[PDB]
């Protein structure tokens, strides 16, 4: 099951735009980007391979002329993140939470960043789906950008799904920047998350599967082709920019519709 | 999956009409037709066969008695379509939009700014009636509305009957349902995923003036002799009055007051 | 195989008010009191089956059509034929059947239907005995039921569903029962089609049918068991009816109308358009 | 199919509590308990009593053993007053197994007494008592009668010839149905509880406590007593863990947790 499968976008028959005028650019964490998707790193042979495709493809890469941001677990003290930032000069700091993966100081550390840190920073949930309450909390600390990342061992089906968390977070989007990740397989999933209102979409699982299957050159090729697919899809939806996608009509089916129809 | 399978017609137990008084005629593209369904590089053989059944069975087809219409892509200039009309003197012109088909085609159209221009020229300059036809993905309401605004009188809403995109578009029933608010502003024609006369009746109930068949017709000629296909087809005209008798409807138009129920995905998509 | 009764759940009642033996199974329709709320509808041989069916009805104390006896006639027959049936047999009532789709899907099936309404009008106008208008297999719609009401018909059997592409034409028994509820004060409703067991029977009764007729189920029974065993199974069904009714806390057939139920799936979908 | 699987709890990414702050205590039938789940019960009862005593759990049929005793409502008030006298339990549980008895060829056939018997307890018994359904789900009407009869605690025990063996309502469905009565009576949940997440779900739906039976029988059937004790004790940490992820400090606060309903359960709620 992938929640994006429960979403249908309304096709538009009479196109207004040439394929080449389609604008793929977006903005978050105080930065303009050429492309609305990016790469989150994973052994270390993998991450080198990924930094390679990001650089050639001109994509942000979240851990030379490579658009760079750094990640740190919120379990670490604030000084550790401040130092990561000083040493690396990333576009921004991303701090992640994995409650259930873990299952205290976390909110202390979070507090410390929101107030002290001068560079833009992002709070990232790690796959369990970030609930509205937590989104509101972050907003109240003055967090400007969150990665909403959604989906004994009777508990491992825990958490909300990506699409579902994106839908719930919709009322808050005029107050915070939303980033989606988790369960994104291809450019249609990407377009879906954007339609739902994410500023951009982080890729993880898919990228690793690609490098495990394809050489870096092949992946670079695949990823650049994905750029085309994005334009193609948006042409078909009659949208000339990334922002216009937020006006695309869509339909919910199955569990996703159920979840929104209580 | 076919979306018509998610529609249930309410049958009527005590009939008022005999099987032989049921009226099958309809009207669109400025023409009267006796029947509410019609037919849409070797290839050229299959089309000889289809034209044959059409002429014989009295169906529109898209032989001086053959009721013919001709098709052209909207990517062509208005002038090309006009040549077509002048050349073949068809009942009407059918202009197709196949955006997604083009986009997925390696050698396909890549620029579309002109499509709207071409469409405008037809609505305002073409004498003969024309139909704007979608090719397979389901014509959305916004497109329909624009057409209406440009002065288009008839549309074929043709819905769904890398590989991650192969389920793009809306289903036929679904597009007919969405289009219902505009059915008094433009003529709706149905096509895509029409298997049999029950699908035909369903499309008409939802409010289409008529229903085009394609795939089903290949399938038939692809496993029967013209003579035998003409048989099934004429017999479909008898399935139509039969179905209609049991729905207690005496004319095509009356089918729009047949009560029905929606189930599953089709109902889901209609109740957001 | 889909059966719409399976889309209905009855709300159990934990704390019983009644003893099992006081549960009353008696009902009333077409001007007759009957001991039980289910009856049998008959099938060239053929005759052999109907012999067996009549023997279980007689022994089990059940109404049998066509001993508690009623007669059936196709509505394509002229009224006088129905009249002579009543005169000759002295049945409890006359059941007149319509089978439109069945006639349509049949080569020889009489394709002229103009006379059915005429004949129905004739029976309403001339026939003293109560008579039932009975759909055959496809579900009687609210429009037909209302027309019956207008003609003076007091009882209908709404008999729902329980080339090939028309093989699933028509409404399911449960669905037709639900559609008919708003008319249940103006006409008596009988259910048939797709009744497999006493729980199906209870469900139909809850939905508001006065009684339910069995057809295919009876045929299946005599095909698998001796007549003795069928009699045993059927009398056992009586106890099942009381048992279920006890569990629901309903002491009479009429009280089943007050039983809470939930709808699921297609059946629920059918009521949430 | 288990009805709890149609319920999704809305979790909380950044908590407010540690696992040590989580209060697991509850109260019903006049008694404080340190834990919100308990055991419903011969050689197997032998073992189950040893797990309960050692784990500090209520045990409904060892001076430290928190004991309660069960009796069928088909018994006259005399037999139940005896039970209390003989065993000095924390409370008496009176069960109603209507459908079970109807499907028993030797089972009860008269029932008019049951409501009489219930009212006697309601009038003659000093010791608190619980009215317990056995497996088929206690319906709103029956609960309302208990209320009017003065009964203060019920176990709503839900689902979780053969055409009848899906009779009754599921545990979660009966919980949902009973909600409007949760300020008028104590609701105990049982029937198809597999693990601590089912426990939490029942508590969130508003039960004061969750009773286990089948699972317990399986555990002492697929394990040794000591293991079972380790198993149940581990369940206690799971409860705090879930409650932390849900950001709840007490059992009570569970009723403010947000949830979504799917499938059959949602369908039953939208008629």
How many angstroms separate the CA atoms of A180 and D15, rounded? 21
How many angstroms separate the CA atoms of B243 and B197, rounded? 8
**Main-chain phi, psi angles of B78, to 5 degrees:** -45, -45
CB contact under 8 A, B110 and A185: no
Do you know the residue count of chain C? 273
DSSP 3-state of D67:
strand
**Residue A86 corresponds to which tokens in the numbers above?**
């000083």
CB contact under 8 A, B143 and A13: yes
How many angstroms separate the CA atoms of C157 and B200, rounded? 31
Cβ-Cβ contacts under 8 Å, C104 against chain B: 19, 242, 245-246
Q: Measuring CA to CA, which residue among B129, B123, B116 is closest to residue B75? A: B116
**C181 appears as a binding residue in the annotation:** no
Q: Which residues pair with B188 in a beta bridge?
A: B155
Q: What is the separation of C-alpha D241 from the centre of its chain, rounded to a whole number of angstroms? A: 22
Query: Residues D258, D247: contact at Cβ < 8 Å?
Result: no
How many angstroms separate the CA atoms of A147 and A200, rounded? 10
Q: Which of C116, C170, C273 lies at the smallest CB-CB distance from B15? A: C116
Query: Residues C178, C270: contact at Cβ < 8 Å?
Result: yes
CB contact under 8 A, B13 and C171: no
Q: CB A191: neighbour CB atoms within 10 A?
A: 25
Do you know the residue count of chain D? 271
- Smallest CA–CA distance from B265 into chain A, residue: A253
Query: Residues D87, D69: contact at Cβ < 8 Å?
Result: yes
Q: Measuring CA to CA, which residue among B245, B241, B204, B267 is closest to residue B24? A: B241
A170-173 contacts at long range (C-beta below 8 A, 24 or more positions apart) = A170/A196, A170/A197, A171/A132, A172/A132, A172/A135, A172/A136, A172/A139, A173/A197
- Smallest CA–CA distance from D269 into chain A, residue: A262
Instruction: Identify residues of A whose CB sits under 8 angstroms from chain B CBs.
Output: 8, 10-20, 185-188, 229, 232-233, 235-236, 238, 249, 251-254, 257
**C134 appears as a binding residue in the annotation:** yes
How many angstroms separate the CA atoms of B95 and B29, rounded? 12
Spell out where chain C has E strands. 8-10, 27-29, 32-34, 38-41, 64-65, 69-74, 94-98, 131-135, 155-157, 188-191, 211-214, 261-263
Q: Which residues pair with A209 in a beta bridge?
A: none
DSSP 3-state of D229:
helix
**B25 appears as a binding residue in the annotation:** no
Q: Which of C16, C243, C262 lies at the smallest CB-CB distance from D271? A: C262
Cβ-Cβ contacts under 8 Å, B108 against chain A: none
Residue D26's H or E segment, with its range, is strand D26-28
Cβ-Cβ contacts under 8 Å, C144 against chain B: 12-14
Q: Measuring CA to CA, which residue among B169, B211, B171, B170 is closest to residue B188? A: B211
Preceding peptide of C46 cis, ω within 30°: yes
**Residue D82 corresponds to which tokens in the numbers above?**
């005896």
CB contact under 8 A, B243 and C166: yes
- Neighbours of D (≥3 Cβ pairs closer than 8 A)? A, C
Q: CB C33: neighbour CB atoms within 10 A?
A: 8
How many angstroms separate the CA atoms of B242 and B245, rounded? 5
Do you know the residue count of chain A? 262
Q: CB B230: neighbour CB atoms within 10 A?
A: 18
Query: From the annotation, which residues of D make up the binding site for Mg(2+)?
Result: 101
Fold of A1-262: TIM Barrel (3.20.20)
How many angstroms separate the CA atoms of B202 and B258, rounded? 9
Cβ-Cβ contacts under 8 Å, C241 against chain D: none
**Residue D129 corresponds to which tokens in the numbers above?**
């008592």
Positive or negative, the CA dihedral A11, A12, A15, A16 is negative
Query: Residues D31, D24: contact at Cβ < 8 Å?
Result: no
CB contact under 8 A, D270 and C265: no
Q: Which residues pair with C204 in a beta bridge?
A: none
Query: Residues A141, A110: contact at Cβ < 8 Å?
Result: yes
**Residue A168 corresponds to which tokens in the numbers above?**
């719930």
Q: What is the 3-class SS of chain A, one letter each residue?
A: CCHHHHEEECCCCCCCCCHHHCCCCEEECCEEECCCEEEECCCHHHHHHHHHHHHHHCCCEECCCCCEEEEEECCCCHHHHHHHHHHHCCCCEEEEECHHHHCCCHHHHHHHHHHHCCCCEEEEECCCCCCHHHHHHHHHHCCCEEECCCCCHHHCCCCCCHHHHHHHCHHHCCCCEEEEECCCCCHHHHHHHHHHCCCEEEECHHHHHHHHHCCHHHHHHHHHHHHHHHHHHHHHCCCCCCHHHHHCCEEECHHHHHHHCC
Q: Which residues pair with B261 in a beta bridge?
A: B8
Residue B167 buriedness (CB in 10 A; 0-12 / 13-18 / 19+): exposed
Residue linked to tokens 């189930």? B263
DSSP 3-state of C146:
helix
The torsion of the CA quartet A162, A168, A170, A173, rounded to 10 degrees, works out to -80
CATH of B1-272, one of 3.90.79.10, 3.10.180.10, 3.20.20.70, 3.90.190.20: 3.20.20.70
How many angstroms separate the CA atoms of B24 and B106, rounded? 43
How many angstroms separate the CA atoms of D139 and D122, rounded? 20
Q: CB B45: neighbour CB atoms within 10 A?
A: 10
Q: What is the 3-class SS of chain B, one letter each residue?
A: CCHHHHEEECCCCCCCCCCCCCECCEEECCEEECCCEEECCCCHHHHHHHHHHHHHHCCCECCCCCCECEEEECCCCHHHHHHHHHHHCCCCEEEEECHHHHHHCCCCCCCCHHHHHHHHHHHHHCCCCEEEEECCCCCCHHHHHHHHHHCCCEEECCCECCHHHCCCCCEHHHHHHHHHHHCCCCEEEECCCCCCHHHHHHHHHHCCCEEEECHHHHHHHCCCCHHHHHHHHHHHHHHHHHHHHHCCCCECHHHHHCCEEECHHHHHHHCC
How many angstroms separate the CA atoms of D95 and D88, rounded? 18
**Residue C199 corresponds to which tokens in the numbers above?**
């729980």
Report DSSP letters for D159-213, one per residue. B--GGGTT-S-BHHHHHHHHGGGTTTSEEEE-SS--SHHHHHHHHHHT-SEEEES
Query: Residues C131, C95: contact at Cβ < 8 Å?
Result: yes
Cβ-Cβ contacts under 8 Å, B169 against chain A: 11
Cβ-Cβ contacts under 8 Å, A186 against chain B: 162, 164
How many angstroms separate the CA atoms of A88 and A100, rounded? 30
Fold of D1-271: TIM Barrel (3.20.20)
* Residue to substitute from D2, D5, D14, D245, interface A, most A β-carbons within 10 A: D14
D and A make contact (3+ CB pairs below 8 Å): yes
How many angstroms separate the CA atoms of D141 and D131, rounded? 14
**Main-chain phi, psi angles of B262, to 5 degrees:** -105, 140
Q: How many CA atoms lie within 13 A of A1 on its CB side?
A: 14
Q: What is the separation of C-alpha C162 from the centre of its chain, rounded to a whole number of angstroms? A: 12
How many angstroms separate the CA atoms of A71 and A92, rounded? 9
**C216 appears as a binding residue in the annotation:** yes
Chain A, chain D: beta-carbon pairs less than 8 Å apart: 63
**C14 appears as a binding residue in the annotation:** no
What was the experiment behind these coordinates? X-ray
Cα separations in angstroms, D11 against A117, A194, C147, D147: 28, 24, 57, 34
Q: What is the separation of C-alpha B151 from the centre of its chain, rounded to a whole number of angstroms? A: 20
β-pair type (D26-28, D7-9): unpaired
**Residue D212 corresponds to which tokens in the numbers above?**
């286990």
Instruction: Identify residues of C whose CB sits under 8 angstroms from chain D CBs.
Output: 9, 11-21, 196-197, 199, 240, 243-244, 246-247, 262-265, 268, 271-272
**Main-chain phi, psi angles of B73, to 5 degrees:** -75, 140
Query: Residues A165, A127: contact at Cβ < 8 Å?
Result: no
Task: DSSP letter for C262, please.
Answer: E
Q: Which of D110, D163, D167 lies at the smallest CB-CB distance from C197? A: D163
How many angstroms separate the CA atoms of C93 and C77, rounded? 17
C and B make contact (3+ CB pairs below 8 Å): yes
Locate the domains of chain D by residue range. 1-271
How many angstroms separate the CA atoms of D235 and D233, rounded? 5
**Residue C248 corresponds to which tokens in the numbers above?**
């629901």
How many angstroms separate the CA atoms of C26 and B259, rounded? 37
Q: Which of C100, C147, C272 lies at the smallest CB-CB distance from B246? A: C100
Q: Measuring CA to CA, which residue among B58, B43, B17, B3 is closest to residue B194? A: B3
- Neighbours of B (≥3 Cβ pairs closer than 8 A)? A, C
- Please enumerate in sequence order all residues whose Cβ is within 8 A of that of A179, keeping only pairs 6 or more positions apart, or say none: A28, A122, A124, A145, A146, A147, A148, A198, A199, A200, A201, A202
Cβ-Cβ contacts under 8 Å, A252 against chain B: 268, 272
Q: Measuring CA to CA, which residue among B78, B83, B87, B115 is closest to residue B100? A: B115
Query: Residues B244, C104: contact at Cβ < 8 Å?
Result: no
**Residue A120 corresponds to which tokens in the numbers above?**
């833009």
Query: Residues C79, C126: contact at Cβ < 8 Å?
Result: yes
- D220 in the Ramachandran plot: left (φ > 0), alpha (ψ -120 to 50) or beta? alpha
How many angstroms separate the CA atoms of B141 and B120, rounded? 18
Positive or negative, the CA dihedral A70, A76, A82, A83 is negative
Q: What is the separation of C-alpha B39 from the centre of its chain, rounded to a whole number of angstroms? A: 9
Q: What is the separation of C-alpha C232 from the centre of its chain, rounded to a whole number of angstroms? A: 22
Query: Residues C256, C26: contact at Cβ < 8 Å?
Result: no
Cβ-Cβ contacts under 8 Å, D118 against chain C: 15
Query: Residues C256, C206: contact at Cβ < 8 Å?
Result: yes
Cβ-Cβ contacts under 8 Å, C269 against chain D: none
Question: Chain B closest CA to A124's CA: distance in Å?
Answer: 28
Domain C1-273 grouped into CATH 3.20.20.70: yes
Q: CB D258: neighbour CB atoms within 10 A?
A: 14
Residue B27 buriedness (CB in 10 A; 0-12 / 13-18 / 19+): middle
D and B make contact (3+ CB pairs below 8 Å): no
**Residue D42 corresponds to which tokens in the numbers above?**
């011969």
How many angstroms separate the CA atoms of B126 and B70, rounded? 14
Residue D71's H or E segment, with its range, is strand D66-72
Cβ-Cβ contacts under 8 Å, D98 against chain C: 13-16, 246-247
How many angstroms separate the CA atoms of B1 and B160, rounded? 10
Q: Which of B16, B197, B261 lies at the smallest CB-CB distance from C273? A: B261
**Main-chain phi, psi angles of B221, to 5 degrees:** -65, -25
* Residue to substitute from B2, B7, B11, B13, interface C, most C β-carbons within 10 A: B13
- Please enumerate in sequence order all residues whose Cβ is within 8 A of that of A152, keeping only pairs 6 or more positions apart, or say none: D195, D238
Q: Which residues pair with D37 in a beta bridge?
A: D210
The torsion of the CA quartet A23, A24, A27, A31, rounded to 10 degrees, works out to -100
β-pair type (D26-28, B210-213): unpaired
How many angstroms separate the CA atoms of A89 and A69, rounded? 8
């Amino acid at each position: 099951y992938n929640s994006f499968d429960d979403i249908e976008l309304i096709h538009h028959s009479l196109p207004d735009y040439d394929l080449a005028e389609i604008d793929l650019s977006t903005h978050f964490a105080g930065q303009d980007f050429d492309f609305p998707f990016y790469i989150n790193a994973m052994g270390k042979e993998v991450n080198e391979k990924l930094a390679q495709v990001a650089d050639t493809c001109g994509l942000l890469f979240v851990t030379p002329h490579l658009l760079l941001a750094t990640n740190i677990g919120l379990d670490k003290p604030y000084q550790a993140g401040l130092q990561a930032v000083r040493d690396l000069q990333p576009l921004f700091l991303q701090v992640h939470i994995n409650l259930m993966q873990e299952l205290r100081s976390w909110k202390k550390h979070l507090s410390d960043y929101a107030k002290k840190l001068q560079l833009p920073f992002i709070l990232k949930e790690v796959g369990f789906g970030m609930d509205v309450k937590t989104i509101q909390t972050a907003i109240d600390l003055g967090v400007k950008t969150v990665d909403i990342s959604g989906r004994r061992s009777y508990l491992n089906q825990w958490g909300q799904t990506t699409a579902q968390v994106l839908l719930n977070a919709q009322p808050l989007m005029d107050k915070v920047e939303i980033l989606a990740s988790g369960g994104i397989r291809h450019p249609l999933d990407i377009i879906k998350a954007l339609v739902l209102g994410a500023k951009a979409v982080g890729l993880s699982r898919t990228m690793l599967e690609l490098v495990e299957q394809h050489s870096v050159h092949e992946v670079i090729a695949i990823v650049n082709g994905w750029k085309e697919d994005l334009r193609l899809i948006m042409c078909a939806l009659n949208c000339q920019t990334i922002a216009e996608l937020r006006n695309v009509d869509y339909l919910l089916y199955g569990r996703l519709r159920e979840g929104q129809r209580q």
